[PDB]
Design a protein around this nucleic acid. Structure first.
Ligand SMILES: [Mg+2]
Ligand SMILES: [Zn+2]
Ligand SMILES: [Zn+2]
Lengths: 1358, 49
DNA sequence: GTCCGGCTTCGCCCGTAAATTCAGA
DNA sequence: TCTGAATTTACGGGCGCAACTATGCCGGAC
RNA sequence: UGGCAUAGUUGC
C-alpha cells in the first residue's frame, strides 16, 4: 500500500483540494430535530449523509441510488464512513498566522525574517506597524512603527510607502523574500564574519532557508488563509442524558472561529471604520490561535466549568493524545481481567482460567465449533445456546481450550516477563489461578492483585505464544543470566527445613540402602527428616561424550537430603543437595541444571521442587510466635554506650570544638555503629540459640528458631527486618532523604512508645511517598531508554570487527563484587587470550565464552579479557550477533533478529521502578555504613599506589595530597587482590611497594572533614582576605587566640564579590615558599565554609592540616536517591565543576596569566604549537610548566564530563565510564544488570557525528549527521579512488538522541510533538518507518521478531 | 519541676481509625496505616462479632 | 418552559534562546 | 564609543502503568 | 448510547 510518510506545509490550494465544501454557518444541530444544519459545522452536503445510503430528506434510501446527489438538499447518497474522512474548510476573512510556526521556540517566522519574537508578536496582534518596500525613504525593511511613528510617516512620507499591520503585513514580508538570494548573502556573510554567536545565528538562518529551498514549501504558506476543518465524526456530538448534547471542545473552538470570521466579513462588506475591523482581525487571530493550540499564546480560553478547551495540538500531543493513548497502546477485544489466586497444583506451562471468562473470551470459537458440529445452523442459534450456558457448550469450551495459549499480563509490565503465555485449565470460580513459580517474574503477590488475560487469535499469534512467551521458555531473566522462576518463600523454606541436620534426632547414625529407604523411614515415623545418616547414593556424571555414567557411593547425609535427592535429575552431582539449600542455593541448583541438562529437565525439576517444598513445609509446621523474637542481653549496654558517646560529642559541640554539621554526622555514625553491634549480637544469640544433647556433652548447632530459620533460608526478610523485630531498629529518614539524628531505641517486640512511634511515621511517610510520588522518575527514565533504543535490532551474524573493550574484575574499593567470571560470561572474545605464562593461545579469537570457557579462565587465573562490545560494532543499522553475545534469556548466542534495544531499556528501567516501589519494605530505616575512617588489609601482599602524589610530614608518616589515590593490594603473583580509595589527606602507615599481612590497618583519616594539607613548610599568611565579607572571624578573648570561617558565595557581599581567601606559605623573610622545583607560589585556596583554627603567622611543618572543611552529611543511600545519578549519566549532563582535560599532547607552558584567568598552552613535538586553553586561576592545576602530558590527561581534578572523555579518550573510554558509573549505583542497591544493556544504550547515545572536513563527500562543513550514514558514505568513497570525510563522534542524552532521529514519527510520539512536527513540516521530511515505534503506530509487522523475515523479504522485493 | 503540662491521654496522638488497632505500637507505621485504611473498607457481615 | 451566545496567583528540574555584563580595543 | 564570550534571566517542555466506584455536565431573553 | 471533569479506592 505504502512505504513512507511525507509531511509538508499545506498550501491553500492543497487545503481547498482536501475540503469538499466551505463551512459558513456556526450552527451544528437544530436541537429540536436532530438533523444537521444546512452548511454548518455538522452538514450533510459538505460532509456526507448521516445514515448509510440514505439522503437527508429521504428522497433516496437504497443502494440503487449509490452515487447520485439529491437536488432538494444536495447530499451525495453513500455510506457514513466517508463522513468520517471528509474534511471541510473555512475561508478566513483576513490572513491569519499559524501559531505553531510563530511560537515554536525557536520561531520559524521570527528567524526566517530575522526578526525577534517580541516584535513579530507585536505586529501580528495589531499593536505596531511594519514597513514593506521602504524604498527611497527614511525607513528600513523590518523596522517597526507604532501609532505615533506611523502617523509621522504618513504625514511626512505620503508618497509611495507601505506599512501594513497584522498577519497581512507578515504574509507580505514572507512573500517578498527571495530564498536563494538570501541564502547567498547569508552564506557569503558567514564566510566574511568573525564573531561566534553571530556565526551560530547565521548558520541557523542558512539551515532554515536551505530547508525551505530544498523542500517544496513556501514561506507565505506559514500564514493561514484557508483553515481546514476536521471531519464531523472525529469531533462528534453525542447526546447526553436529556436533550442536551455533549459539550464538545473542538466544536466550540471551530464555532467561535466561524463567528469572528463571519463578523469580520460583514464588517468589511460595509467598510467599517479601521479601528473596529482592526480589533475584529485581532480577535479572529486569537480565536484561530486558540483553535490550533489553545493556551500557547496565553490566556487559555475556557468554556463552561472554566476548563481550557482541548485544541488540535492538545489532542495530538501529550500523554492523553493520540500517540500515547490510541496508537502506541490501545484497548483490545478478547481480553478480560480478574483477581489472581495461587493454585499450587498447576504445572509451569498452565494457568487456571475461570469457566465464565473462558466462555466469554472464546465466544467466536465456540460459535465456529457449534456450526462445525451442526448443533446450531444460524449464528443467532449458536449465540442463544452460548448465553443459556447449556450442558453441551461447556464440552465445546473444553475441546477448544486444549491447545490455545492465553497471555497473562500484570499491570506494571516493567520488563518482558510481565506478560507470559499459559495453557488454560478451566476452573470453577471467579479468580485466575497463577503458578507460584512465575509470581516472582510478575512481582505478583496474592493480596488483591489483578491480572489480565488476552487470547491470541491467529495461528501465528498462537504459535508465538507457544514458542516465545510460554512460561516454560522464560526460565532465565532477560536482564541477567540468573533464573527467574526460582522458588520464592514457601518452597525455599520447605527445602531448607528438609535439607538440614541436628546433632541428635530419631534414626541418627543408621545406614540406609537408598533415598527410597529414607522416604520410607521418614513416612513411617522411624527417623526424623533432619538426622545424620549414611545413604547409598548413585549419582550420574556426564563427563563422557554425552554419556551419563553412574557412580555409587556411601554419602554422609540426612534423611531429608536423601528424600530430596529423589527429585534431582540424573546428570547433576550429589553435592548440589548436600547443603542447607537456602534460596540462593536453590537458584544455583536450577541454573546448573539448566546449563548442564537443558530446558525440559529444568522445567520438570522446578515443578518437582515446588511440589516437594510445599509438601515438606506443610509437614514441618513451621510457625511464628512471640517467644521467637528473643531480645539480646547486650542490647541495653550497647544502647548505654552509644548514649554516652552522643552525650560526650554534644558536650564537645557546646564547647565549640565542632560545628553542627559534623556533630550531626558523628552522631549518625556512632548510632549506626551501635545499631550494627546490636544486630550482630542479636544474630549471634539467635543462630546458636539451641544447644541440644541427650547422648553426652553439649553440642552447639544452628538454631531451629522460626525467625532465624526463615531469615537464613532467604524465604522472606533479611537482616534489616529481623533486626527491627528483635534488635533496636535504628535511625529513620525523612521523605527528603534527611536522616533523623534521634534513633529509635526500642524494637517491635517491645513497646515503641508515643514519641518513638512519632519518629517512625517520618520514615513510613518517606517510604509511601517514594512509592507514589518518585515512581514517575523511574517510569520516565525507562520510557526515555525505550524510546532512544527501540530501532536497534540484531541484523547480521558477524561484522568481522577486531575492536572491543577490556573487561576486568571490578573492585571499587572493597573486595571483589563482580569477578571476571560474571563480566565476560556469554560474550565473544575480540583477541586471542594468551595464557598468563608465555604467549600460548588459551582461547581462540571468536569463541563465545560460556561456562566451561569461563571456568578455564578462572583455573588459569586471567586478569583481563578483551571482548567484542555492541558499541564497537561495524554494522550499519543494527548489531551483529557476535558483538552482542549471549542472549541471557537462553543459553545460546543472540538469534538474528531479536530486538536487544527494547530488552536493554526494560532491563535498565525495571529494577529502578521496582526498588522505588519496594523502598517501603523496611519501614523507613536509613541504610548506613560505618563511614570507614581506615583501610584494614585482609590478605598478605604487596601494596602499590596509583594516581598518588604524597609527602612526608614531621612524624615521618606519609600523607596523601592527591584526590584520586588508589591503594591496590597486589598478590605475590602480580594479581591485584584488593583495591581501596584513599581520600585526599589520609595518613599511610606503610608506603608504596611495601609488604603487609592481613588484619593490620595501612591507612586512616577523618571522614567528616576534608583537610587542606600543604606541600612545604613555612609560616601562614591570610592573603587576599578582608575581615567582614571575605571571612567571619570569631574572637576567643579569654584564651586570647582567634578562629575564622570562610563564608561561601551565598553569604559574602556582592560589593567586592571576587575576594579569594587563601593561605599562602611564606618564608621567614616574608616571601612565598615555592613548591619543589616549580615557578608558582605554594598558596592553598580556601573553599566556602572552611574552618581555620590557625592564627596569622604561625609556624607549621610539611604535611600539616591548615584548615578542615566539614564534609556535609549524606542522607539515606537507597535507590530513590541514586536513580537521579543514573538519569544524569544517561542524559550526559555536564558536571558543575568539570575536570579540565588536555585536548592535545606535548609540553606544557603557562602563558600571560592575564586577569586571574591563567592561560595554558600545550606545544606538541612538531604539531600545532599555538593551541591554548583558558583556565581560571582559582582552581588547582595538576600539571605545571615541566612535564609531558597525553591527551585526555587531567589538568585539574573533579568530575569528568562524558563529552570530554568521548572527544579525547575515545568511545571505549566513555562507554566504560558510563558502564562503571551506573553499575556502581545499581550494585549499591543489589541490582544485577549485565553490561550489554548499558553498552547498547551508550551506543544509542553516540549515534550522531559532526563533520570536520567535507573531504570528497557531499556533506556540509560542520553539520551533524547519522554516524552510520557518514560511515557508509566514507566506505563507498574509499571503495573508489576518492577520500572519505573525517568526522567527530558526539555524545547525546537519551532524550536528545531519541528526539534527534531521522524519522519524525518516532520523535513525535516521544516528547515535544509540537516542535518535532513543526520542524518536520518546515523541512519537508520523509519517514521510511523502518523502526519499531513507527511500525507499531502504522499497524504492520514489527521488524524485530517473526516480522524481521517479512521486512527483509519486503526490502528484497522493494 | 519544669513540667508545665502533661498529655491527657496516650491515644491523643492518633485518630479514631488507628486507635481501633490493638497492639498498634508493635506494628510498623506503614502497616498501621494500611490497617486503618482497610478497616475503612470492611463490609458489614450478617451478624456482628 | 423554548431558543441563543463568547477572575487566579502558590512545584522541581533542565535545555535553549534572549538579554546583560564583563572585558577589552 | 563598538564588539565578542561568558554569564544571567526568561520561558517552554517533562513529570510511570493498569484497574474499579460515585456525581455533575451552561446561563441568559421571549 | 460510547465523551470530559471532580472525588474516592486497589495493585504495584
Ligand atoms: Mg499485591
Ligand atoms: Zn435530499
Ligand atoms: Zn559487530
Amino acid at each position: 500500500e505504502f512505504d513512507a510518510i511525507k509531511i509538508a506545509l499545506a498550501s491553500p490550494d492543497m487545503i481547498r483540494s482536501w475540503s469538499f465544501g466551505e463551512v459558513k454557518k456556526p450552527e451544528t444541530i437544530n436541537y429540536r430535530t436532530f438533523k444537521p444544519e444546512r452548511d454548518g459545522l455538522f452538514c450533510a452536503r459538505i460532509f456526507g449523509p448521516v445514515k448509510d445510503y440514505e439522503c437527508l430528506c429521504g428522497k433516496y434510501k437504497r443502494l440503487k441510488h449509490r452515487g447520485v446527489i439529491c437536488e432538494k438538499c444536495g447530499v451525495e447518497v453513500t455510506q457514513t464512513k466517508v463522513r468520517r474522512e471528509r474534511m471541510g474548510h473555512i475561508e478566513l476573512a483576513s490572513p491569519t498566522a499559524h501559531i505553531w510556526f510563530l511560537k515554536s521556540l525557536p520561531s520559524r517566522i521570527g528567524l526566517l525574517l530575522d526578526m525577534p519574537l517580541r516584535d513579530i508578536e507585536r505586529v501580528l496582534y495589531f499593536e505596531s506597524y511594519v514597513v514593506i518596500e521602504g524604498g527611497m525613504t527614511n525607513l528600513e525593511r523590518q523596522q517597526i512603527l507604532t501609532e505615533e511613528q506611523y502617523l509621522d510617516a504618513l504625514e511626512e512620507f505620503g508618497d509611495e510607502f507601505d506599512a501594513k499591520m497584522g498577519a497581512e503585513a507578515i504574509q507580505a514580508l514572507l512573500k517578498s523574500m527571495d530564498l536563494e538570494q538570501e541564502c547567498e548573502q547569508l552564506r557569503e556573510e558567514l564566510n566574511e564574519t568573525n564573531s561566534e554567536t553571530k556565526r551560530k545565528k547565521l548558520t541557523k538562518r542558512i539551515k532554515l532557508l536551505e530547508a525551505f529551498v530544498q523542500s517544496g514549501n513556501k514561506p507565505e504558506w506559514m500564514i493561514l488563509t484557508v483553515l481546514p476543518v476536521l471531519p464531523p465524526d472525529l469531533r462528534p456530538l453525542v447526546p447526553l442524558d436529556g436533550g442536551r448534547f455533549a459539550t464538545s471542545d473542538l466544536n466550540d473552538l471551530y464555532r467561535r472561529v466561524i463567528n469572528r470570521n463571519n463578523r469580520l466579513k460583514r464588517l468589511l462588506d460595509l467598510a467599517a471604520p479601521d479601528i473596529i475591523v482592526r480589533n475584529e482581525k485581532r480577535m479572529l487571530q486569537e480565536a484561530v490561535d486558540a483553535l490550533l493550540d489553545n493556551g500557547r499564546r496565553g490566556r487559555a480560553i475556557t468554556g463552561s466549568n472554566k476548563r481550557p478547551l482541548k485544541s488540535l495540538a492538545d489532542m495530538i500531543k501529550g500523554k492523553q493524545g493520540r500517540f500515547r493513548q490510541n496508537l502506541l497502546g490501545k484497548r483490545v477485544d478478547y481480553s478480560g481481567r480478574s483477581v489472581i489466586t495461587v493454585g499450587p497444583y498447576l504445572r509451569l506451562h498452565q494457568c487456571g482460567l475461570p469457566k465464565k471468562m473462558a466462555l466469554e473470551l472464546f465466544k467466536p470459537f465456540i460459535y465456529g465449533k457449534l456450526e462445525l458440529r451442526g448443533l446450531a445452523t444460524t449464528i443467532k442459534a449458536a449465540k442463544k445456546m452460548v448465553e443459556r450456558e447449556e450442558a453441551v457448550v461447556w464440552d465445546i469450551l473444553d475441546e477448544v481450550i486444549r491447545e490455545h495459549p492465553v497471555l497473562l499480563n500484570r499491570a506494571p509490565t516493567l520488563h518482558r516477563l510481565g506478560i507470559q503465555a499459559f495453557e488454560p485449565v478451566l476452573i470453577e470460580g471467579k479468580a485466575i489461578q497463577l503458578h507460584p513459580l512465575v509470581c516472582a517474574a510478575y512481582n505478583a503477590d496474592f493480596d488483591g492483585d489483578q491480572m489480565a488475560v488476552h487470547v491470541p487469535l491467529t495461528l501465528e499469534a498462537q504459535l508465538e505464544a507457544r514458542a516465545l512467551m510460554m512460561s516454560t521458555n522464560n526460565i532465565l531473566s532477560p536482564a541477567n543470566g540468573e533464573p527467574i522462576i526460582v522458588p520464592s518463600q514457601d518452597v525455599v523454606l520447605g527445602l531448607y527445613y528438609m535439607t538440614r541436620d541436628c546433632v541428635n534426632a530419631k534414626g541418627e547414625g543408621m545406614v540406609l540402602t537408598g533415598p527410597k529407604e529414607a522416604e520410607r523411614l521418614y513416612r513411617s515415623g522411624l527417623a526424623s527428616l533432619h538426622a545424620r545418616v549414611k545413604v547409598r547414593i548413585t549419582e550420574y556424571e556426564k563427563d563422557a561424550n554425552g554419556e551419563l555414567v553412574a557412580k555409587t557411593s556411601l554419602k554422609d547425609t540426612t534423611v531429608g537430603r536423601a528424600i530430596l535427592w529423589m527429585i534431582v535429575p540424573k546428570g547433576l552431582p550429589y553435592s548440589i543437595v548436600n547443603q542447607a539449600l537456602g534460596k540462593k542455593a536453590i537458584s544455583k541448583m536450577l541454573n546448573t541444571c539448566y546449563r548442564i541438562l537443558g530446558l525440559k529437565p529444568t522445567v520438570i525439576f522446578a515443578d518437582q521442587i515446588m511440589y516437594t517444598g510445599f509438601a515438606y513445609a506443610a509437614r514441618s509446621g513451621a510457625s511464628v510466635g512471640i517467644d521467637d523474637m528473643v531480645i539480646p542481653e547486650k542490647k541495653h549496654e550497647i544502647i548505654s554506650e552509644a548514649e554516652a558517646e552522643v552525650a560526650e560529642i554534644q558536650e564537645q559541640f557546646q564547647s565549640g570544638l565542632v560545628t553542627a554539621g559534623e556533630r550531626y554526622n558523628k552522631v549518625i555514625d556512632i548510632w549506626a555503629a551501635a545499631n550494627d553491634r546490636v544486630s550482630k549480637a542479636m544474630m549471634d544469640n539467635l543462630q546458636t540459640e539451641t544447644v541440644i544433647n541427650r547422648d553426652g556433652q553439649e553440642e552447639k548447632q544452628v538454631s531451629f528458631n522460626s525467625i532465624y530459620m526463615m531469615a537464613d533460608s532467604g524465604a522472606r526478610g533479611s537482616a534489616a527486618q529481623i533486626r527491627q523485630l528483635a534488635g533496636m531498629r535504628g535511625l529513620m529518614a525523612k521523605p527528603d532523604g534527611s536522616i533523623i539524628e534521634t534513633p529509635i531505641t526500642a524494637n517491635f517486640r517491645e513497646g515503641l512508645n508515643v514519641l518513638q512511634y512519632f519518629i517512625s511515621t517520618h520514615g513510613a511517610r518517606k517510604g509511601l511517598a517514594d512509592t507514589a510520588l518518585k515512581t514517575a522518575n523511574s517510569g520516565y527514565l525507562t520510557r526515555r531508554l525505550v524510546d532512544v533504543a527501540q530501532d536497534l535490532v540484531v541484523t547480521e551474524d558477524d561484522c568481522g570487527t577486531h575492536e572491543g573493550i577490556m573487561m576486568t574484575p571490578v573492585i571499587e574499593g572493597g573486595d571483589v563484587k563482580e569477578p571476571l567470571r560474571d563480566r565476560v560470561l556469554g560474550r565473544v572474545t575480540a583477541e586471542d587470550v594468551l595464557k598468563p605464562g608465555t604467549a600460548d593461545i588459551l582461547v581462540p579469537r571468536n569463541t563465545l565464552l560460556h561456562e566451561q570457557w569461563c571456568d578455564l579462565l578462572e583455573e588459569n587465573s586471567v586478569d583481563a579479557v578483551k571482548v567484542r562490545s555492541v558499541v564497537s560494532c561495524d554494522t550499519d543499522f543494527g548489531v551483529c550477533a557476535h558483538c552482542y553475545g549471549r542472549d541471557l534469556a537462553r543459553g545460546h548466542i543472540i538469534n538474528k533478529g531479536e530486538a536487544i534495544g527494547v530488552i536493554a531499556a526494560q532491563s535498565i528501567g525495571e529494577p529502578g521502578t521496582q526498588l522505588t516501589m519496594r523502598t517501603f519494605h523496611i519501614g523507613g530505616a536509613a541504610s548506613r555504613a560505618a563511614a570507614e575512617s581506615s583501610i584494614q588489609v585482609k590478605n598478605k601482599g604487596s601494596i602499590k599506589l596509583s594516581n598518588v602524589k604524597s609527602v612526608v610530614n614531621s612524624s615521618g608518616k606519609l600523607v596523601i595530597t592527591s584526590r584520586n589515590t588508589e591503594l591496590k593490594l597486589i598478590d605475590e603473583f602480580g594479581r591485584t587482590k584488593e583495591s581501596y580509595k584513599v581520600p585526599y589527606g589520609a595518613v599511610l602507615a606503610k608506603g608504596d611497594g611495601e609488604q603487609v599481612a592481613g588484619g593490620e590497618t595501612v591507612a586512616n583519616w577523618d571522614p567528616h572533614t576534608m583537610p587542606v594539607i600543604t606541600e612545604v613548610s613555612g609560616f601562614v599568611r591570610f592573603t587576599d582576605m578582608i575581615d567582614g565579607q571575605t571571612i567571619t572571624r570569631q574572637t576567643d578573648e579569654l584564651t586570647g587566640l582567634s578562629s575564622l570561617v570562610v563564608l561561601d558565595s551565598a553569604e559574602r557581599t556582592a560589593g567586592g564579590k571576587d575576594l579569594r581567601p587563601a593561605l599562602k606559605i611564606v618564608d621567614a623573610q616574608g616571601n612565598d615558599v615555592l613548591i619543589p622545583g616549580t615557578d608558582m607560589p605554594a598558596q592553598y585556596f580556601l573553599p566556602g565554609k572552611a574552618i581555620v583554627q590557625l592564627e596569622d603567622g604561625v609556624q607549621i611543618s610539611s604535611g600539616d592540616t591548615l584548615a578542615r572543611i566539614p564534609q556535609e552529611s549524606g542522607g539515606t543511600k537507597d535507590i530513590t536517591g541514586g536513580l537521579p545519578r543514573v538519569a544524569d549519566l544517561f542524559e550526559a549532563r555536564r558536571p558543575k565543576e568539570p575536570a579540565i582535560l588536555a585536548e592535545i599532547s606535548g609540553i606544557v607552558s603557562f602563558g600571560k596569566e592575564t586577569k586571574g584567568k591563567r592561560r595554558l598552552v600545550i606545544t606538541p613535538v612538531d604539531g600545532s604549537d599555538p593551541y591554548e586553553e583558558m583556565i581560571p586561576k582559582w582552581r588547582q592545576l595538576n600539571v605545571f610548566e615541566g612535564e609531558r602530558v597525553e591527551r585526555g590527561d587531567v589538568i585539574s581534578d573533579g568530575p569528568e564530563a562524558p563529552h570530554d572523555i568521548l572527544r579525547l579518550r575515545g568511545v571505549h573510554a566513555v562507554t566504560r565510564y558510563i558502564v562503571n558509573e551506573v553499575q556502581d549505583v545499581y550494585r549499591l542497591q543489589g541490582v544485577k544488570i549485565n553490561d550489554k544493556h548499558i553498552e547498547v544504550i551508550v551506543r544509542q547515545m553516540l549515534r550522531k557525528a559532526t563533520i570536520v572536513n567535507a573531504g570528497s563527500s557531499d556533506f556540509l562543513e560542520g553539520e551533524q549527521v547519522e554516524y552510520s550514514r557518514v560511515k557508509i558514505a566514507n566506505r563507498e568513497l574509499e571503495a573508489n579512488g576518492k577520500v572519505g570525510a573525517t568526522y567527530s563522534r558526539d555524545l547525546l542524552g537519551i532524550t536528545k538522541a531519541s528526539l534527534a532521529t531521522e524519522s519524525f514519527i518516532s520523535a513525535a510520539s516521544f516528547q515535544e510533538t509540537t516542535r518535532v512536527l513543526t520542524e518536520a513540516a518546515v523541512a519537508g521530511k520523509r519517514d521510511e518507518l523502518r523502526g519499531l515505534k513507527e511500525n507499531v503506530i502504522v499497524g504492520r509487522l514489527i521488524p524485530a521478531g517473526t516480522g524481521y523475515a517479512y521486512h527483509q523479504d519486503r526490502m528484497r522485493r522493494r | 519541676d519544669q513540667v508545665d503540662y502533661m498529655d491527657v491521654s496516650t491515644q491523643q496522638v492518633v485518630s479514631v481509625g488507628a486507635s481501633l488497632i490493638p497492639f498498634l505500637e508493635h506494628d510498623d507505621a506503614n502497616r498501621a496505616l494500611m490497617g486503618a485504611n482497610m478497616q475503612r473498607q470492611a463490609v458489614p457481615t450478617l451478624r456482628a462479632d
